[PDB]
mmCIF file of C-alpha atoms and ligand atoms in Angstrom:
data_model
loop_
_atom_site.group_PDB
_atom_site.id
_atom_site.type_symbol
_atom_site.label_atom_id
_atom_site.label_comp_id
_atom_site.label_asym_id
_atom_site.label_seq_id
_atom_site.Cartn_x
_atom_site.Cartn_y
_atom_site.Cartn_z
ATOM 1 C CA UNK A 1 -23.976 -16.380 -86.436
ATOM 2 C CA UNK A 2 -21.987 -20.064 -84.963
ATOM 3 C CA UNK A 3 -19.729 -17.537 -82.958
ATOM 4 C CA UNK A 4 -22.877 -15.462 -82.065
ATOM 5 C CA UNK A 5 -24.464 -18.488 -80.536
ATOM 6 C CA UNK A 6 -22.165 -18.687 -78.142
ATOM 7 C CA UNK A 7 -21.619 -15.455 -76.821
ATOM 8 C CA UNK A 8 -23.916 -13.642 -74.654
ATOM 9 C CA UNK A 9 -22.975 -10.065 -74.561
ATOM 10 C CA UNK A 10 -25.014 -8.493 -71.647
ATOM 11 C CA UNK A 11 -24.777 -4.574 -70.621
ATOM 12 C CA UNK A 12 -25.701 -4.131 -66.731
ATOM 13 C CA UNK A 13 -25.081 -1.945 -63.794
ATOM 14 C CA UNK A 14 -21.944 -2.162 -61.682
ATOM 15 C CA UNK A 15 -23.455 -3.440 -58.145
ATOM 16 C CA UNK A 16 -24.992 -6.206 -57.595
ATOM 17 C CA UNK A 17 -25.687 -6.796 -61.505
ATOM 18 C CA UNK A 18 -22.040 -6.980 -62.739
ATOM 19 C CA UNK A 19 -20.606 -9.052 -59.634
ATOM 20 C CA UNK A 20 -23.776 -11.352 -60.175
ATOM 21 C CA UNK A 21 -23.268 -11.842 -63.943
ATOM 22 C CA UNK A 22 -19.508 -12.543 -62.932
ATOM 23 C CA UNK A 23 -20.361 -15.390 -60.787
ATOM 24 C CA UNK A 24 -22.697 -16.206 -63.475
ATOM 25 C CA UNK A 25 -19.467 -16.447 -66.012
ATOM 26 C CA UNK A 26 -18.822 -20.127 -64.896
ATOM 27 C CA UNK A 27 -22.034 -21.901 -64.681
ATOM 28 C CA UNK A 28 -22.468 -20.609 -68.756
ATOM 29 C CA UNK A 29 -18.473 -21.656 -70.061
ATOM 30 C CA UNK A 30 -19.710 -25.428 -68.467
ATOM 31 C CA UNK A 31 -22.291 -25.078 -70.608
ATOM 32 C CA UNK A 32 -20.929 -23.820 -73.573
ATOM 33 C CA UNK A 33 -21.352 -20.108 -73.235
ATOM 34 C CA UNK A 34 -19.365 -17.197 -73.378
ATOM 35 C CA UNK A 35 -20.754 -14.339 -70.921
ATOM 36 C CA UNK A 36 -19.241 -10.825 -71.839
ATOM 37 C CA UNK A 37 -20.369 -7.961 -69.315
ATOM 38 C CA UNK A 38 -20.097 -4.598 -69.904
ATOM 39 C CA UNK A 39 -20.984 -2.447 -67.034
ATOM 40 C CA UNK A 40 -22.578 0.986 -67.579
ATOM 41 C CA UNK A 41 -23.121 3.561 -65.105
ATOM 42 C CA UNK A 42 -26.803 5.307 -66.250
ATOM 43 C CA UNK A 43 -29.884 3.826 -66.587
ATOM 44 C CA UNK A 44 -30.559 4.831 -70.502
ATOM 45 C CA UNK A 45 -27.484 3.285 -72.899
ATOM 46 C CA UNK A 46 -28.589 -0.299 -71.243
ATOM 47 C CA UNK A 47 -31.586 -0.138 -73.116
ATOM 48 C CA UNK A 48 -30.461 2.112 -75.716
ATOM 49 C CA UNK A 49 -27.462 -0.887 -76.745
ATOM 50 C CA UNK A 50 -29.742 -4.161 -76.567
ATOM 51 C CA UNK A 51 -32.535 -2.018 -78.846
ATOM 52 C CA UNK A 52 -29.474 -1.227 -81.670
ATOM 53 C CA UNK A 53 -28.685 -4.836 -81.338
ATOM 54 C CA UNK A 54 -24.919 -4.424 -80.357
ATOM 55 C CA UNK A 55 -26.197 -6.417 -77.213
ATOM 56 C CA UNK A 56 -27.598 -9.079 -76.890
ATOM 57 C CA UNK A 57 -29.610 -8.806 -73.324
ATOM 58 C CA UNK A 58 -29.339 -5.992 -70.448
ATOM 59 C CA UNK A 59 -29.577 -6.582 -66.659
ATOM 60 C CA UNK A 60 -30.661 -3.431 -64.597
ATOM 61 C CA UNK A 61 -34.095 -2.588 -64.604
ATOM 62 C CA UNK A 62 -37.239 -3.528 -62.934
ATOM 63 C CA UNK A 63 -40.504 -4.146 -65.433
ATOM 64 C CA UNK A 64 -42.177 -0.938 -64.513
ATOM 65 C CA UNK A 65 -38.965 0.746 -66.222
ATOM 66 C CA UNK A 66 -38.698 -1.002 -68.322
ATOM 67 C CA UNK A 67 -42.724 -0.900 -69.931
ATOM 68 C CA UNK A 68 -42.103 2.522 -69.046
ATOM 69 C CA UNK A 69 -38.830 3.193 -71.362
ATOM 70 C CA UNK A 70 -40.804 1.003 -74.208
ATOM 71 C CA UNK A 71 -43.366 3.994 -73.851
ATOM 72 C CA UNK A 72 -41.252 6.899 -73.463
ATOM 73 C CA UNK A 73 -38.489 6.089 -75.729
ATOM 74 C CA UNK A 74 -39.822 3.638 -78.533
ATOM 75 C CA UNK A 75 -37.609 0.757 -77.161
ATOM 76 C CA UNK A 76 -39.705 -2.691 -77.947
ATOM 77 C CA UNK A 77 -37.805 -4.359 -75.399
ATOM 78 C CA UNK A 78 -39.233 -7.906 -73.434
ATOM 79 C CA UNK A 79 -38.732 -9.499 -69.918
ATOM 80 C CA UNK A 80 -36.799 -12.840 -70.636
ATOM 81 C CA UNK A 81 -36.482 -13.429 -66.940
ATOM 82 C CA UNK A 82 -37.174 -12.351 -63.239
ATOM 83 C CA UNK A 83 -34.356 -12.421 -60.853
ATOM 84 C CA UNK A 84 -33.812 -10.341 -57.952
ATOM 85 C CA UNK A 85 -35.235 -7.329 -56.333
ATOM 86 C CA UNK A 86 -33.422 -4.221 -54.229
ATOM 87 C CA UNK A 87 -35.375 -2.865 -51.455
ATOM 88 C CA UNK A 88 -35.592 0.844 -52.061
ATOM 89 C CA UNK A 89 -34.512 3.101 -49.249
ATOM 90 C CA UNK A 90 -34.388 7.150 -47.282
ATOM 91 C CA UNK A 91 -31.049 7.598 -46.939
ATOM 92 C CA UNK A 92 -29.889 10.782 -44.730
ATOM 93 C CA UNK A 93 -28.970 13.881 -46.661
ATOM 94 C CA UNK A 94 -27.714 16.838 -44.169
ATOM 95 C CA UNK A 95 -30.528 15.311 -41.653
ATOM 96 C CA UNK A 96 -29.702 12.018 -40.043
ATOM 97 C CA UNK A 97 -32.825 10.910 -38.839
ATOM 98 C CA UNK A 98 -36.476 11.566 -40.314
ATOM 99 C CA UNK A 99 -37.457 12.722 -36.912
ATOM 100 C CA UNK A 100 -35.550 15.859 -38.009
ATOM 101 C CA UNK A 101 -37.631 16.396 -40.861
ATOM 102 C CA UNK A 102 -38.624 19.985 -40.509
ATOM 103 C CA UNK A 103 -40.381 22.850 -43.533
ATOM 104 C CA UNK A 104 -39.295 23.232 -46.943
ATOM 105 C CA UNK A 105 -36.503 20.361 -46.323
ATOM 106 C CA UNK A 106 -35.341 19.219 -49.794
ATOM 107 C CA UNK A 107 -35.747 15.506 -50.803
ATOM 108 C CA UNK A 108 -33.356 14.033 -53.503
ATOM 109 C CA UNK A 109 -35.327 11.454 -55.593
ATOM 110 C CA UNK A 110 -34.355 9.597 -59.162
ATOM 111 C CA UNK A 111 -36.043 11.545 -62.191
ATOM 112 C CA UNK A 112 -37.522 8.485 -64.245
ATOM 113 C CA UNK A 113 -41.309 7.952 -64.392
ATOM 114 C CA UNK A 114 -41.559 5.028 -62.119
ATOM 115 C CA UNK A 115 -38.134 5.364 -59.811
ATOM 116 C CA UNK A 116 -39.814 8.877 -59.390
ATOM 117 C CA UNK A 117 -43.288 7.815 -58.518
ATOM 118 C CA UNK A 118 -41.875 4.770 -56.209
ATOM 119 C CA UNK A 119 -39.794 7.332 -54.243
ATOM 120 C CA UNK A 120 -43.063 9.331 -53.802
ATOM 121 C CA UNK A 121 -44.632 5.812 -52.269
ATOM 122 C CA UNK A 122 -42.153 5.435 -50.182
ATOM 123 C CA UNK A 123 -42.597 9.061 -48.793
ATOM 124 C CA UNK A 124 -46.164 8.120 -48.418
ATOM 125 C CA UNK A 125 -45.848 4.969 -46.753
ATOM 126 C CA UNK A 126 -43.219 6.944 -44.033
ATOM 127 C CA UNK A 127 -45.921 9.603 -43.573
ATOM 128 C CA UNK A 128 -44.386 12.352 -44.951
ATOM 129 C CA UNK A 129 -46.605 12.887 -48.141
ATOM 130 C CA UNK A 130 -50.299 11.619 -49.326
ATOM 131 C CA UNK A 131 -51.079 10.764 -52.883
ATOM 132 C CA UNK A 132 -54.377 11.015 -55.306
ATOM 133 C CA UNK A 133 -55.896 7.895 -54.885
ATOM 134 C CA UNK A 134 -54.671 5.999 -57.906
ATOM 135 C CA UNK A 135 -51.806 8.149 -58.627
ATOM 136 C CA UNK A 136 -49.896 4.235 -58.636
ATOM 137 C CA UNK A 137 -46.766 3.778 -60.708
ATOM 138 C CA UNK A 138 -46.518 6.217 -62.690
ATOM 139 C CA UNK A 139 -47.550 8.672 -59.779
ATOM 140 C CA UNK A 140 -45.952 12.471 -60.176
ATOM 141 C CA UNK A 141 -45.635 15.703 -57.620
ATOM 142 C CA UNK A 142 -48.617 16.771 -59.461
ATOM 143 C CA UNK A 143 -50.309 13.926 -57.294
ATOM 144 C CA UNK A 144 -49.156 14.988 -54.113
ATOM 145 C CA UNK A 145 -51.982 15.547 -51.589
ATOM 146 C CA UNK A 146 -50.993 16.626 -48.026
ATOM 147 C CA UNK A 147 -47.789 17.682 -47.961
ATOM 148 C CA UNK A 148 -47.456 18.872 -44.208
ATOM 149 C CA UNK A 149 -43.921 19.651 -43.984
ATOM 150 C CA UNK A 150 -43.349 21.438 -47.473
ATOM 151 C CA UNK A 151 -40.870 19.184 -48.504
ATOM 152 C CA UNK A 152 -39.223 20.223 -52.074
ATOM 153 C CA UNK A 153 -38.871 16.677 -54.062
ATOM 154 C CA UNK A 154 -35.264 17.644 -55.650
ATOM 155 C CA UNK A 155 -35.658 15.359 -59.049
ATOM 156 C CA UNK A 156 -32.512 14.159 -60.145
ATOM 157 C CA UNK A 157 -30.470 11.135 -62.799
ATOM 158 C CA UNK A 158 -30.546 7.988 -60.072
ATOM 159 C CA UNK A 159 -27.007 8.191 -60.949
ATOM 160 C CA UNK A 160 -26.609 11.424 -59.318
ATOM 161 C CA UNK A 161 -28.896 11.389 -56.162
ATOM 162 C CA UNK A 162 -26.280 9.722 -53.941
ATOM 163 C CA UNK A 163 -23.749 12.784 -54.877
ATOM 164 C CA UNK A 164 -26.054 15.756 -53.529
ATOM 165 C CA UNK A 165 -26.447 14.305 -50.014
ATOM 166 C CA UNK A 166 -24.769 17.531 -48.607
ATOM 167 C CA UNK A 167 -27.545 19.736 -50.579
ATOM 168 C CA UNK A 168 -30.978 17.966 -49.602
ATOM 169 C CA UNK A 169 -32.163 16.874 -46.403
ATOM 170 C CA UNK A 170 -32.409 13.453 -47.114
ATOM 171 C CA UNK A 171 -32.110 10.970 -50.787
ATOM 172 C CA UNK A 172 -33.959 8.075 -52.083
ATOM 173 C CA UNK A 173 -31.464 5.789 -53.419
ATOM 174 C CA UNK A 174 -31.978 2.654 -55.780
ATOM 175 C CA UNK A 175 -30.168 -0.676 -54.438
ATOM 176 C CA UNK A 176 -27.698 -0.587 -57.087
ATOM 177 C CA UNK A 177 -26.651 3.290 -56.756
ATOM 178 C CA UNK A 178 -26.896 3.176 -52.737
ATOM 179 C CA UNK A 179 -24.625 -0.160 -52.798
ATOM 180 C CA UNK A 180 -21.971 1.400 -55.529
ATOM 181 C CA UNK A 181 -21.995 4.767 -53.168
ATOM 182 C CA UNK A 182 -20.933 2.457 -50.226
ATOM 183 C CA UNK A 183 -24.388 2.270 -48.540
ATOM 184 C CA UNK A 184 -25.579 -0.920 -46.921
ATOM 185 C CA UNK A 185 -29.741 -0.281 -46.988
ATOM 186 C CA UNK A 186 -29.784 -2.864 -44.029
ATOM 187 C CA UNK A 187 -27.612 -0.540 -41.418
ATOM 188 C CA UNK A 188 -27.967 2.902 -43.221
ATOM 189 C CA UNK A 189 -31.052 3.511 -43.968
ATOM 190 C CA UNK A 190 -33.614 5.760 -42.575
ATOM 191 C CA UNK A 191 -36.473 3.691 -44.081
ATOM 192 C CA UNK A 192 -37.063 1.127 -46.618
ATOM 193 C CA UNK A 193 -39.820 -0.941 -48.490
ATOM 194 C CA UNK A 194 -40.179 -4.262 -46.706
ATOM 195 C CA UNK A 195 -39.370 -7.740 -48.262
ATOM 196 C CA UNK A 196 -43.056 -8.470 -48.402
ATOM 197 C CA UNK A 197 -44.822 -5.166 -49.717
ATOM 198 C CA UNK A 198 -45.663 -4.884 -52.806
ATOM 199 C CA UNK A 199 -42.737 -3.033 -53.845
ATOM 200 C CA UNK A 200 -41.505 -6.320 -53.272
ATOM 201 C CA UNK A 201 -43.223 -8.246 -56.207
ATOM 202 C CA UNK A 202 -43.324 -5.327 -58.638
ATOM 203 C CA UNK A 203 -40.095 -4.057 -59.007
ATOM 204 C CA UNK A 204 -38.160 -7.114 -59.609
ATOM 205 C CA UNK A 205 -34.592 -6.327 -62.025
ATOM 206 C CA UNK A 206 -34.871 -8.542 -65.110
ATOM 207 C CA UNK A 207 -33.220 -10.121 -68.209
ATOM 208 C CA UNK A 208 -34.764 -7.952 -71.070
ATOM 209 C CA UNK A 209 -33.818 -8.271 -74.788
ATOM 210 C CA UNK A 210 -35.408 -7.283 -78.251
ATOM 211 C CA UNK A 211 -38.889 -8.793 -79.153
ATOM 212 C CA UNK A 212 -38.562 -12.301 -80.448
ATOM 213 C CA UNK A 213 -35.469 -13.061 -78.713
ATOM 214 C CA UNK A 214 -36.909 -13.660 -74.755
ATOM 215 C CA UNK A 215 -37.063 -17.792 -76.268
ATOM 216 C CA UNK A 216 -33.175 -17.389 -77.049
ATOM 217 C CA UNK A 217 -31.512 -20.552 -76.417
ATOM 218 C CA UNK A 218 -28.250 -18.809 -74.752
ATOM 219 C CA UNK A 219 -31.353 -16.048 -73.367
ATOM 220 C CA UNK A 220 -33.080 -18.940 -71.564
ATOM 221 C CA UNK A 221 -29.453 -20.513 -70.122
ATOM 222 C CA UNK A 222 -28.561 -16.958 -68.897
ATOM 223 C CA UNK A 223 -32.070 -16.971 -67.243
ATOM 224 C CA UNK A 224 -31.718 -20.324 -65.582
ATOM 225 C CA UNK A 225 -28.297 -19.710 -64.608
ATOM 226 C CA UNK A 226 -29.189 -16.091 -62.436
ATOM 227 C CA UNK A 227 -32.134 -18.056 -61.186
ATOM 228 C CA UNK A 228 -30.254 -21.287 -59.963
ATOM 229 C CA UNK A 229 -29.496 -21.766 -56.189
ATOM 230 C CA UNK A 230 -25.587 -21.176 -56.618
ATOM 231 C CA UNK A 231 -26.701 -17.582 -57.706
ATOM 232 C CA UNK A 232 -29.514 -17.323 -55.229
ATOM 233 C CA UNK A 233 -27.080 -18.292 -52.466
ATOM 234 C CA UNK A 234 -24.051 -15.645 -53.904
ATOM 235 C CA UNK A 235 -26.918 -13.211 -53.814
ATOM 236 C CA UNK A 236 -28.210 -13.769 -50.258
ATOM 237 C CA UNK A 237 -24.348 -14.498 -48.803
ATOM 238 C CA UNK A 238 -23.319 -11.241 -50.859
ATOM 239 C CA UNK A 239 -25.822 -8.410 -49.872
ATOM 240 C CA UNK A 240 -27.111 -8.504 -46.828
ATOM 241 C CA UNK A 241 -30.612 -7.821 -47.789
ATOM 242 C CA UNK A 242 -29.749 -5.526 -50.364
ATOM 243 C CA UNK A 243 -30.368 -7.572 -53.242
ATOM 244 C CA UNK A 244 -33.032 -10.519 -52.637
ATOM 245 C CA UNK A 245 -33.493 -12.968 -55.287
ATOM 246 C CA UNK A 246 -36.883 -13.471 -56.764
ATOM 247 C CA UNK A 247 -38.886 -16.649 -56.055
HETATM 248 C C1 LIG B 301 -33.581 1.055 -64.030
HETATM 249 S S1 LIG B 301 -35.020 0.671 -62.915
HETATM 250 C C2 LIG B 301 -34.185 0.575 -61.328
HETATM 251 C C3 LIG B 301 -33.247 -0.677 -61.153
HETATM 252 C C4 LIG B 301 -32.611 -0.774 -59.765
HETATM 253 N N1 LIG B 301 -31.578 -1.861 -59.724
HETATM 254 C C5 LIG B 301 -33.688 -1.080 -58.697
HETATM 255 O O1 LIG B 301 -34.004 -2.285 -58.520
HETATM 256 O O2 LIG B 301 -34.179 -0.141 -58.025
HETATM 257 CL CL1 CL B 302 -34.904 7.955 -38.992
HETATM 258 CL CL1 CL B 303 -32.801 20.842 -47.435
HETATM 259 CL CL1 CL B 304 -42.006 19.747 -54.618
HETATM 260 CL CL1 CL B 305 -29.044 6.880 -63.689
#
């Protein structure tokens, strides 16, 4: 395990998490550390390859996914560290503006438990659904209200949702997917959660690993390296607003 100790092998997404663990690379070798990235393009195998142990951290979920996938898939993964979070957005579909929204309009929305139910928050916080009081996190379309305009929520892989804007009205893209589709959530879209909602402070994309490893030596230096101000200041330099590092 001497040649273990000094590699961290990390799965993440492509955009930000694969350019930020890149940047990352150099503040770990001065320390000793050998980051390897491997970038995957769904949001199951990252979990699925730090669980089997072939990895030895992931960075690309928020906690509600992740306490979610622990739940749903019999992962007992942990948050080892905070760092950043990606405003959620509307993003036009075949309509441009929500001031087109019109009956039966299709909405394209990720398929997971909680990227599900936060697309459904957003809706309601841009008027266009209500929700059972308490529906929360985990909210479904079973706890749709009012739904004046009929909309069809179109539940897709948050992979996929940026590829059917030419059959729904409108999608509701994660940071990651929007920004490796070419979308800049700052210019494109239609509406997004704000910087200080509490979207904000709950979804924040993490550093998670298997139980008993979140005190890691190498976990800890990967943690304190995303979380120091050279990272903080690629982050906020980098994404204009897109990806917001957590404090
Ligand atoms: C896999 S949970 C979603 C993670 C995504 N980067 C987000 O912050 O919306
Ligand atoms: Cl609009
Ligand atoms: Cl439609
Ligand atoms: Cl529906
Ligand atoms: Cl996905």
């Amino acid at each position: 395990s001497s040649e273990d100790a000094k590699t961290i092998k990390v799965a993440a997404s492509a955009t930000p998490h694969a350019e930020i663990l890149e940047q990352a690379k150099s503040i770990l070798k001065k320390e000793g550390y050998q980051l390897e990235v491997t970038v995957f393009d769904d949001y199951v195998q990252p979990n699925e390859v730090v669980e089997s142990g072939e990895f030895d951290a992931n960075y690309f979920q928020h906690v509600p996914y992740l306490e979610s996938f622990n739940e749903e898939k019999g992962t007992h993964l942990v948050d080892a560290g905070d760092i950043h979070y990606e405003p959620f957005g509307i993003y036009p579909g075949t309509k441009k503006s929500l001031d087109e929204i019109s009956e039966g309009d299709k909405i394209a929305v990720p398929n997971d438990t909680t990227n599900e139910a936060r697309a459904l928050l957003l809706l309601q916080d841009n008027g266009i659904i209500t929700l059972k009081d308490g529906a929360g996190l985990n909210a479904t379309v079973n706890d749709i209200e009012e739904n004046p305009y009929n909309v069809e929520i179109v539940e897709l892989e948050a992979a996929q949702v940026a590829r059917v804007t030419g059959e729904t009205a409108y999608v509701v893209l994660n940071g990651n997917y929007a920004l490796e589709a070419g979308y800049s959530v700052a210019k494109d879209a239609l509406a997004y959660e704000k910087s200080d909602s509490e979207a904000a402070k709950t979804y924040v994309n993490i550093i998670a690993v298997k139980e008993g490893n979140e005190k890691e030596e190498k976990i800890q230096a990967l943690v304190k390296a995303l979380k120091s101000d050279e990272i903080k200041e690629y982050i906020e330099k980098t994404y204009d607003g897109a990806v917001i590092p957590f404090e």
